[PDB]
């Protein structure tokens, strides 16, 4: 209040430097402050959400501004395959001369933009820098609008009631209809009116869209259900994207498959797509009751789902209370669903590449995947971490009297025993099979390897029509039920995309699929072993069942009762961050070494040399860091010196993590005392005495900052290697 | 394209903004 932490006086009393670090790290924990009540919490997070969305749109207006002002965007639009897309320019006063000739792409020395943003803005139909300036101003306006709301809903006449936040009953009716249905339907209002004509040559700006309809006849004779007119003339084969030549004029054709030339999804397919998703989400918005009262009461929707079998507790009685009155359950489901959405998005940005001339720049497709995968694993780990925060600082087992959650805490020993079982099964049967293949290949014999065909994924590709296997089932068999059931609609345009091999849809498969996918399921079941462990033993363990009392991230219980290093529910986050980075590590290493074998062409280089570990470390890490690690020589440098300097940099970050993770506090707590003696005793400087007392970082913080350097070093090392590797083998 | 604006804005955000922000935040420990 009066000290540094202007919010909690329990830290302002501490004259050490703990008040700084805990004053920073508890700044957003609004549930545990001095006098921040229930209404005062929601009225703070409702404003800080506006501040956050203002930061998102300041970020996107930043990308619009640098691409608008320093990129080569419309020069890239002139030649999408040839020209490497520029990011923002450089102003280093540290580039002497020789680095300045290692960046010249035009007059600017800008970075090559490895983020796929020109492809998305080129499928949107921005063919200018001017439209990017009007967009950048158009999001400075929106960011200023959200900041003005964040000032507005913290002025006291406009800070809303808590019952308005407990109008959970109607947030879903407004979000699913408006935020999803109206924004998606309006997004067809951008695809149909901009992305359909500006890909068919017709530059339709803000000046002429209220005069030129996307169909030559429209909407006065078209409430009649003659909807085959809108999907009448598809762009069939002989089209180059952006131009008006070789293209039809239909709006909502569902072709299926790719472009033949740009290897992207059809924008007619997307217009029909978000139009359908728009209608279905608007139908979903009409779900629950409100002040009108035609829908579903949420208390009736959960309590009525109780089985007469009696096995599943006394039903969901209590769950509606412990989502409204709780928050980390709602945040846990939020990060859970967003995390599955991000992993799904990464599992479709490469698979069905939506954007024109992606799968042609081989680095941005490899940056988006690994991007949304590490964000995906972060968001799962957050969903479980607020799982444990829900079970500690938010869980009431009396409104949850023998409820489904109380049933979950009841049988949690079986859940942790079986995650430990399946994790122990996979880790002796990837490492069993990889050390078998590595020993056996090492002794001059690739043949005596255990290779198991992953038959189940090959069979599922046979259910989606990949005819390169010889199963001849539902879609790979042309005489089945489903193969005839959409014979005209979207199948024959799509099996061209399936049975092709260059495209990244339903990849060709050897036993590296088998062994790696067991390693990935190993990574998931281990990481959920940690998280479900420290999220169900978050409340109480038989080492110490007082764990509900000490809050979430208390340090330990001291050396008593055997020793108690990291008993808290913060070890679920703490250890599952290392397993998260390991698992998303193995995912994106596997994906990246798959597509470096497709794009180079030698898939036989993968399938013969990926089932043993020196196949990875030899054929992928040692070979594909060759353009990385040659990033600057004693002979000179090139454009990848930033990524090799970032590479060595991030090894230094990743190893400064180990100074905090391994070597814990009391070493430094009895060494900062030596430094404080050395400064208290020295002359000419004992005048300059500290105010906050020098104290080594407490071990809630120590394992955190070691974790943070572990992630920053890990992720910056791998973002250095993806981009330097694929930028070195190509471009 | 104003090719002179990063010569002003890059140093004044890169170095002198973490001078006055150190003053505002670090004296704002005591304010």
């Amino acid at each position: 209040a009066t000290k540094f932490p202007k919010f909690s006086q329990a830290l302002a009393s501490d004259p050490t430097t703990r008040r700084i670090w805990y004053g920073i790290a508890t700044a957003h924990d609004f549930e545990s402050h001095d006098g921040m009540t229930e209404e005062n919490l929601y009225q703070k997070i409702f404003a800080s959400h506006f501040g956050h969305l203002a930061i998102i749109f300041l970020w996107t207006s930043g990308n619009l501004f640098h691409v608008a002002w320093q990129g080569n965007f419309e020069q890239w639009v002139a030649n999408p395959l040839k020209t490497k897309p520029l990011a923002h320019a450089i102003w280093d006063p540290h580039f002497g001369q020789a680095a300045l000739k290692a960046f010249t792409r035009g007059d600017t020395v800008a970075n090559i933009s490895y983020s796929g943003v020109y492809h998305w803005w080129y499928t949107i139909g921005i063919r200018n820098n001017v439209e990017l300036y009007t967009g950048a101003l158009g999001l400075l306006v929106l960011s200023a609008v959200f900041l003005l709301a964040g000032w507005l809903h913290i002025q006291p006449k406009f800070k809303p009631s808590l019952s308005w936040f407990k109008n959970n009953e109607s947030r879903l009716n407004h979000h699913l209809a408006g935020l999803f249905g109206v924004s998606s339907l309006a997004w067809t209002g951008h695809l149909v009116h901009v992305a359909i004509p500006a890909s068919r040559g017709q530059h339709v700006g803000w000046d002429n869209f209220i005069m030129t309809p996307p169909h030559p006849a429209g909407l006065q004779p078209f409430f009649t259900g003659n909807w085959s007119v809108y999907a009448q003339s598809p762009d069939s084969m002989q089209h180059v994207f952006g131009t008006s030549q070789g293209a039809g004029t239909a709006i909502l054709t569902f072709l299926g498959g790719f472009h033949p030339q740009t290897q992207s999804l059809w924008l007619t397919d997307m217009a029909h797509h978000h139009l359908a998703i728009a209608v279905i989400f608007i139908v979903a918005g009409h779900m629950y009751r409100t002040n009108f009262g035609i829908g579903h009461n949420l208390k009736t929707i959960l309590e009525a789902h109780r089985p007469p079998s009696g096995r599943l507790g006394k039903g969901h009685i209590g769950i509606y209370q412990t989502l409204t009155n709780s928050l980390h359950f709602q945040l846990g489901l939020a990060l859970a669903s967003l995390s599955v959405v991000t992993s799904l998005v990464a599992q479709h940005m490469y698979a069905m590449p939506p954007y024109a001339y992606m799968a042609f720049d081989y680095v941005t497709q490899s940056a988006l995947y690994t991007h949304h995968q590490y964000i995906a694993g972060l968001l799962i780990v957050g969903a479980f971490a607020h799982g444990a925060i829900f079970f500690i600082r938010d869980y009431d087992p009396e409104q949850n009297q023998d409820n489904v959650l109380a049933r979950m805490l009841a049988h949690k020993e079986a859940v942790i025993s079986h995650l430990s079982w399946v994790s122990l099964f996979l880790g002796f049967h990837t490492l069993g099979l990889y050390v078998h293949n590595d020993v056996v290949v090492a002794f001059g014999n690739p043949e005596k390897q255990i290779l198991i065909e992953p038959i189940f994924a090959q069979w599922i590709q046979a259910t989606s029509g990949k005819m390169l296997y010889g199963f001849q089932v539902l879609l790979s068999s042309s005489t089945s039920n489903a193969s005839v059931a959409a014979q005209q609609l979207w199948l024959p345009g799509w099996l061209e995309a399936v049975n092709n091999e260059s495209n990244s849809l339903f990849l060709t498969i050897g036993p590296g699929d088998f062994l790696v996918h067991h390693a990935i399921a190993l990574g998931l079941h281990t990481t959920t072993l940690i998280l479900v462990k420290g999220a169900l033993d978050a409340r109480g363990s038989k080492l110490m069942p007082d764990k509900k009392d000490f809050g979430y991230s208390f340090p330990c219980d001291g050396p008593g009762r055997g020793g108690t290093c990291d008993i808290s529910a913060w070890d679920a986050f703490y250890l599952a961050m290392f397993w998260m980075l390991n698992t998303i590590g193995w995912v994106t290493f596997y994906w990246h070494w798959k597509h470096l074998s497709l794009w180079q062409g030698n898939v036989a280089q993968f399938n013969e040399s990926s089932t043993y570990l020196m196949g990875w470390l030899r054929d992928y890490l040692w070979l594909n860091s060759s353009p990385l690690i040659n990033g600057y020589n004693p002979y000179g440098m090139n454009s990848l010196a930033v990524w090799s300097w970032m590479f060595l940099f991030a090894h230094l970050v990743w190893a400064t993590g180990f100074m905090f993770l391994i070597s814990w506090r009391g070493y430094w707590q009895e060494l900062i005392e030596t430094l404080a003696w050395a400064h208290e005793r020295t002359p000419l400087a004992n005048l300059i005495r500290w105010k906050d007392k020098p104290v080594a970082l407490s071990i809630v913080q120590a394992r955190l900052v070691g974790l943070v350097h572990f992630t920053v070093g890990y992720i910056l090392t791998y973002a250095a290697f993806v981009i330097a590797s694929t930028a070195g083998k190509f471009s | 394209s104003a090719s002179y604006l990063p010569s002003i804005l890059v140093p004044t955000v890169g170095l002198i903004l973490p001078f006055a922000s150190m003053a505002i935040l670090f004296i704002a420990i005591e304010k």
Partner: peptide, 27 residues
């Protein structure tokens, strides 16, 4: 690609900066 539009942008994010610091010393 032009000059005065950049100045319009820095004015609008100067206003946005004043709304950010206007949000800052109230929460």
């Amino acid at each position: 690609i032009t000059d005065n539009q950049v100045f319009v942008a820095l004015i609008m994010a100067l206003v946005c900066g004043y709304l950010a610091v206007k949000l800052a010393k109230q929460l």
